[PDB]
Structure formats: structure tokens, C-alpha cells
């Protein structure tokens, strides 16, 4: 099991994959985002580094970055009916991770319990776990437990989003971990076995 030494090792690993902005920005909040990511099991973080994943922390909009300019004005998958486009999205995950500094908490342009953990969970799912959220086993769990964490007409509709949000509950803090264990016991056991 993880302990404070593992977390310090995780902070070192994250310092090697996180890309910070230059100039003025909320530097302490960016570092606080890293410290929340350091609670993720080190096995996942090590694998992200081995796969040369970069976690970009941004001081502006995602589409202000050169590599995401192509998404300007594009409606993200799953955002139909929001009235919004990628210009408004505070974080993305998958093959890359890009996150607006300061927008971590639920309601800051998104409804994840925590922006960076949800987005990094997607990257782990896709890059490290070969899209395990789409596996027959996780889909079976998702069908039963996917509506137990609120936002039921979004988390309960997309298995990849329920996976990422459950992962964020598991690792954000002790209260969200305990809440997940009570609300989604099969998902909790699934995530616990994954980190063995």
C-alpha cells in the first residue's frame, strides 16, 4: 500500500511529466493540482511517464494552445445540448492531458468531482489499461452502478466517464473513497484489484 514516501516519489514523477506555464499564474494552485494527482497509485503514474505522457497545466483556455486550436468552435462528444464548445471545456484527457489551472473543483465549468483526477483517469484508462472501461467486465459493473454517483444521465450513459469519475472518487480524498465504497461496491473492488 501507498504511504507518505510513495506520495513523495509520485510528486517527483509528476514533476517530470507536468508542463507548467511561463509568466504569471496561480503557481500555488498549479502545484496543489500536482499534489492531488500524487495521491494516484504510483504504478499508474510510472506507466504514464514510461509512455511519455505530458500533463499540461494551462493559464488560459485549452483552445488557446497551438495543438488544440483545431478544436475551436467544435462541440465535444457528450457536450451536445450544453450550448458550449471546446473553447469552454476546462480539461481534457485521453492520449494527452490539458487542464485549466484553478478549475479543479466541481462546478468550475465542469461537473467532475475533481478535474485533474478525472482527466488523468481517462489517460490511464486509454494509455495504460487499453480502454478497460469498455471491457465486457467493466460494462457489466457500469450497467448496475453507473447511476449511483449523481449526474446520472451523463455518468450513467458513458462507461468511460463513469470509470474516470469512479477513479477520481477512489483517489481524491478519504471521504470520496469511502462514499464510493458504499455507493458502488463492485466498482470499488474493481479499482482496488486493478491497483494490486
Amino acid at each position: 500500500h501507498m504511504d507518505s514516501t510513495t506520495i513523495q516519489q509520485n510528486k517527483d514523477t509528476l514533476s517530470q511529466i507536468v508542463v507548467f506555464p511561463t509568466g504569471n499564474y496561480d503557481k500555488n494552485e498549479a502545484n496543489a493540482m500536482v499534489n492531488r494527482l500524487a495521491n494516484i497509485d504510483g504504478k499508474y503514474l510510472n506507466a504514464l511517464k514510461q509512455n511519455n505522457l505530458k500533463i499540461k497545466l494551462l493559464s488560459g483556455k485549452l483552445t488557446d494552445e497551438k495543438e488544440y486550436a483545431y478544436l475551436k468552435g467544435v462541440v465535444p462528444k457528450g457536450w451536445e445540448g450544453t450550448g458550449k464548445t471546446w473553447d469552454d471545456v476546462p480539461g481534457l484527457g485521453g492520449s494527452t492531458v490539458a487542464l485549466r489551472i484553478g478549475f479543479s473543483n466541481k462546478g468550475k465549468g465542469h461537473d467532475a468531482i475533481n478535474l485533474e483526477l478525472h482527466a488523468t483517469a481517462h489517460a490511464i484508462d486509454h494509455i495504460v489499461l487499453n480502454d478497460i472501461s469498455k471491457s465486457a467486465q467493466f460494462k457489466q459493473i457500469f450497467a448496475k452502478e453507473g447511476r449511483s454517483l449523481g449526474n446520472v444521465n451523463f455518468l450513467g450513459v458513458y462507461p468511460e466517464e463513469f470509470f474516470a469519475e469512479s477513479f477520481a472518487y477512489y483517489y481524491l480524498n478519504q471521504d470520496t473513497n469511502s462514499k464510493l465504497k458504499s455507493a458502488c461496491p463492485q466498482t470499488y473492488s474493481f479499482l482496488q484489484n486493478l491497483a494490486k
Binding site: 484527457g93 467532475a112 478535474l115
Partner: peptide, 7 residues
């Protein structure tokens, strides 16, 4: 793979 945060 590209996925936005939950709306």
C-alpha cells in the same frame, strides 16, 4: 483518444 471533462 480525446475526452472532455463532464459538462
Amino acid at each position: 483518444s480525446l475526452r472532455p471533462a463532464p459538462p
